[PDB]
Design a protein around this nucleic acid. Structure first.
Lengths: 78, 103, 108, 94, 51, 103, 78, 94, 108, 51
DNA sequence: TCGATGTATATATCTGACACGTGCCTGGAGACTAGGGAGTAATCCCCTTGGCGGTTAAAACGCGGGGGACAGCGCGTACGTGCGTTTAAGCGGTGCTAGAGCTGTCTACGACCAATTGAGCGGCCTCGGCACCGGGATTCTGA
DNA sequence: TCAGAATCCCGGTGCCGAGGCCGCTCAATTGGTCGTAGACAGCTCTAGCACCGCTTAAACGCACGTACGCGCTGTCCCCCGCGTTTTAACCGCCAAGGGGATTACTCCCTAGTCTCCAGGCACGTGTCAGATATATACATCGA
């Protein structure tokens, strides 16, 4: 019932076959979870400070684009 | 007598399918749950008004970042001349990302 | 009073120039903005948008789509070598990835 | 009843200067709006640090020209300086 | 100026360099168009410079 | 009847030397000539003057950049479990650099 | 003479030993030359564009630092 | 002979403030001056972006709080923000 | 009139808040730069300079030298978490590379 | 505030984390000092946060 | 395992790039507008609930076999290296000169003013791509 | 090699963002002006930009030699794959209610202006650190 376990291994396999991989070890199903978790921590830790400076109890997509720009991987469309 | 296909090869059919379909690949609700976990982890347990279109923006951004690092790891493992993949390949590619993958 | 005119039409261009000069002088980059700056901006921006839309339409005509999907923009960006260098650290929402397969994964 | 601004009509016009026959999605429109805003602020930041580097409070077309020379790769700069110089010779007629 | 006709022939000397076609009322820039051009082992501008 | 010792091992002494020393590693005059060879290629042939401080700074930057990418290539080849080095290792490492060494 | 071979092979060898290499193939003596050449052609064009904007007939140590700082690999002490 | 700018007296002052016993090379002095200039311009650019994002044309300490929370990683930023709050409570008392 | 007393001494610190505010005037970051913000900048720069020079003096003590050559600076910034994360894009003039060997390289 | 004494003990529970020593007239910050901490498999701040 | 043998880790001294003195300003400290920023504020509008119920598109499990992955060994190879001439380059100094910095002094030129006007928000509406559904074309896999 | 099962066009069909489309009213835009940033002149030191000898670390080189990568069982194991069986997220949808972008207002308290004035900033000198001798534990290969 862990929230981190909500990322399912066929969806992990879905992104894997999006990346186009022949075979995968089963070990990766938590390693990708940890990588995604620390990346989400990296962007959310800045996004909450962004909306904290905005002094609102919301989180807009502009804040996420600013957080990705501060991470250095800027995003379009929003 | 029934008989079915070789391993790997019809998964490449799904690979060619997913490289043609540009949609999201993560179920929205577990991803929203797991990021609400992190904002509870940073806002001293309180929750914030998560804008719904911002959710799918972050969903697509994390998906693109993850498939990028994924194929990078598969490329380094194929440089190591083995057709499958290991977490040590992801570990090397994470290490040979620099601080771009860490901010 | 003399009849005025838009300075972009005096430049004969389609991107606005008074608007982007308002963007510059209040966008707080420097203090003094010369008159020749935003016309040079509008010129290079019109060229860049014409470039990306020309490649986008050349992508979209292959799939016979009248409207332009973000996948078309993604394929036009990552298919051209030059603008991909300009947009290396940029990603696209609902753009997907190219058809890009390693060589030796295919069998005999 | 709030007033914002964007470039979508200008994107629609420059669509007609290349493709007078095709349509456009709004997702692509937001991509384009983000794109022009990003490259505008990027080249403006480069121009500001450039003018800071030579202690000039003024910014002319020369600064933008050297900025797109240093920032844009390849023949994009070659066509961009021709576009800009042609546009300023067009505008300086009046 | 006219060196795009020369540089295109200088690039024909074989590889995948998209020449821009010609259609009226379009912008249709004279920017020479390239292969995706993998960079870690790719070619460079050695023949599109003005002497 | 003189006798020899093993190869490679004393090169590790040179590794420990060059990690302890922080000075340059490239000769001044050939590097100055090859860097003055490029303003021929960019300033329409007519060359420019320089600064010797600028020469030292570009020298240090090139040395640090090259040694960093070099050890990156060495560790990525060591991911392939071979202690020696090949240029394809550098091809992977520069390929898995992203847009950083090239803008 | 041809001056591209000025960055000689034992310089590459001692740079490798500072990088900590046990053994190295001989083919690298031109591959390092190529990657150093393209790195130089990256930085020096922007540097001379900087000096050109100063209309300066020399190259100054601040300008190359501005070029690499724009390139994204910054350097102090100059 | 007009004027040159550095922080070298302040570098030596904070050096003796932390270590009244040792010295510093001029190479390290230039390293430190360039370091603090880079850190200052980076945090000032982030502060300008931040004040741009909420249309506060002023910039006060409150932007700097979120700015150094944004740029500096973790407990480094924690000790820095406690240092800054302590200094502004010192200054606002005076 | 008044008695000679600076704002940084009124701040009681060792970094010039007036010169910093002069930079914020000239550097074109806002049109109005507030009161306490250059105080905050001089404070955090004082703290960060303390952070680098503490480990710098520690490394200089461990190599027993009067002045600090930037080898100590390079060894100090690359032996923590945050400053290495702060200065990932930064290299060091005459700082060298760390003593750093791999595990498989050691023979027996 | 005083949690640095607790967080140091929270980090003492088989790792190389340099606690800062104590000497007068020096700055000697309370900034916790770390191993170089390889990042691709490293630990994180899971126990130095205020609940 | 014990021993020669080329290191680098001590040690004495002997110059030469640095840190405090020092006039000297030129950039920093007091007084006071005024007009953007904090604060209130009610108000519509998105979003977070908890629900439905269908549902189907996904997760778990077993087999299953097949096809990679170390594994170690055989073994030609090519780079390591250290002596042996060799070279050129980083040394010293030496005009020198063209070009980087410093004032000077005008002169074109960007902010800061009234006053229209057109263009981008706001329903709106065909409406036609187009997502979607049935159906008939293609191309992997053993016998 | 080729049924046969999995996929790529092909015609139809509701449908719902969407691209003009009308209104509209808030910033561009003409005029002009006015201090003023800088363009240009010109002058003056100065740091590469060439020169000369010198001497010393590099430059093949090669002779063993040794790791090292094809390759081959091999084996085993683990993992597509695939069918079956749960199963739970997803999708309209009600509603709700409540926080949050307002605009409106309404003070208040930080940039310019001016006037003193003094701590950073270009010039000198006694150094500790690089440099040069012993010497020495000390790793590194014989058998």
């Amino acid at each position: 019932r862990d929230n981190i376990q909500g990322i399912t291994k066929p969806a992990i396999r879905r992104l894997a076959r999006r990346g186009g991989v022949k075979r995968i070890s089963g070990l990766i199903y938590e390693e990708t979870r940890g990588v995604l978790k620390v990346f989400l921590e990296n962007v959310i830790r800045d996004a909450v400070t962004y909306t904290e400076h905005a002094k609102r109890k919301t989180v807009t997509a502009m804040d996420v684009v600013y957080a990705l720009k501060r991470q250095g991987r800027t995003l379009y469309g929003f | 007598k029934p008989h079915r296909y070789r391993p790997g090869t019809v998964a490449l059919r799904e690979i060619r399918r997913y490289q043609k379909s540009t949609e999201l690949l993560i179920r929205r609700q577990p991803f929203a749950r797991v990021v609400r976990e992190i904002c509870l982890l940073f806002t001293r347990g309180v929750d914030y008004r998560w804008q719904a279109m911002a959710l799918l923006a972050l969903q697509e951004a994390a998906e693109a970042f993850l498939v990028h690092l994924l194929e990078d790891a598969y490329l380094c493992s194929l440089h190591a001349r083995r057709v499958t993949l290991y977490p040590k390949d992801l570990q090397l590619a994470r290490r040979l990302r620099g601080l771009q993958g860490e901010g | 009073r003399a009849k005025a005119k838009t300075r972009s039409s005096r430049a004969g261009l389609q991107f606005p120039v008074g608007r982007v000069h308002r963007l510059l002088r209040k966008g707080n980059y420097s203090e003094r903005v010369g008159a020749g700056a935003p016309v040079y901006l509008a010129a290079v921006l019109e060229y860049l948008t014409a470039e990306i839309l020309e490649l986008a339409g050349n992508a979209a005509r292959d799939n016979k789509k009248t409207r332009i999907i973000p996948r078309h923009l993604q394929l036009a960006i990552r298919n051209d070598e030059e603008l991909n260098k300009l947009l290396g650290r940029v990603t696209i929402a609902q753009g997907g990835v190219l058809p890009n397969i390693q060589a030796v994964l295919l069998p005999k | 009843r709030s007033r914002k601004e964007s470039y979508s009509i200008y994107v629609y016009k420059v669509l007609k200067q290349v493709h007078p026959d095709t349509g456009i999605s709004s997702k692509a429109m937001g991509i384009m709006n983000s794109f022009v805003n990003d490259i505008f602020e990027r080249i403006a930041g480069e121009a500001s640090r450039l003018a800071h580097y030579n202690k000039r409070s003024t910014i002319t077309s020369r600064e933008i020209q050297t900025a797109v020379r240093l920032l844009l790769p390849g023949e994009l700069a070659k066509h961009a300086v021709s576009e800009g110089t042609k546009a300023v010779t067009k505008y300086t007629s009046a | 100026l006219h060196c795009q006709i020369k540089n295109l022939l200088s690039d024909e000397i074989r590889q995948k360099i998209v020449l821009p076609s010609n259609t009226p009322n379009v912008r249709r820039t004279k920017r020479i168009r390239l292969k995706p051009l993998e960079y870690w082992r790719g070619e460079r501008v050695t023949y599109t410079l003005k002497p």
